[PDB]
């Protein structure tokens, strides 16, 4: 299956694991990046309260402002995933 | 120069124009997507108050939750730019 590589995290270990799990479910179900992102965002809103934002892609850079302990940036296979709550 | 194509906006005309202008300045100065994004985010924080988030790239999808009237998604040349304030 897909290899998870966490690049930058400000987030508990448990929540990082839930992020990888949610992204793995999303990739199993969906092929389009915005749909993958939507699944992850919506699940995190339910599991860890709103308001989350998710970007999924192979080529992008970002500059965001996040709530402390609510940020992860990771690869699952070849796709990069940014998931965070705003500050 | 670069062609601006606004794909989806929830934002005043004036602010949409400032977004395109800021992105044009950013692309003139920087080549790396995260630096482009940082310039735009920081300028919008100053011009239109915090808190903005910016993604710049050629391949990504997103699912975010934004404040009403504070969202734009547009291309400048071949790069896509998402700029918004969180809800």
């Amino acid at each position: 299956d897909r290899k998870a590589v966490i690049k930058n995290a400000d987030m508990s270990e448990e929540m990082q694991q839930d992020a990888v799990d949610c992204a793995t479910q999303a990739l199993e179900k969906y092929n389009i990046e915005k749909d993958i992102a939507a699944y992850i965002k919506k699940e995190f809103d339910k599991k860890y309260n709103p308001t989350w934002h998710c970007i999924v892609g192979r080529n992008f850079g970002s500059y965001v402002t996040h709530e402390t302990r609510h940020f992860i940036y990771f690869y699952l296979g070849q796709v990069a995933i940014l998931l965070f709550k705003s500050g | 120069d670069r062609k601006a194509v606004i794909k989806n906006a929830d934002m005043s005309e004036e602010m949409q124009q400032d977004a395109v202008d800021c992105a044009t300045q950013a692309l003139e100065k920087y080549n790396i997507e995260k630096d482009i994004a940082a310039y735009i985010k920081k300028e919008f924080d100053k011009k239109y108050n915090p808190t903005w988030h910016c993604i710049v790239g050629r391949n990504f999808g997103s699912y975010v939750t934004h404040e009403t009237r504070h969202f734009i998604y547009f291309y400048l040349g071949q790069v896509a730019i998402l700029l918004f304030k969180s809800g």
Partner: peptide
């Protein structure tokens, strides 16, 4: 408390 973060894909 809020923190700025930047990310950049490898590709």
């Amino acid at each position: 408390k809020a923190i700025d973060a930047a990310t950049q894909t490898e590709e």
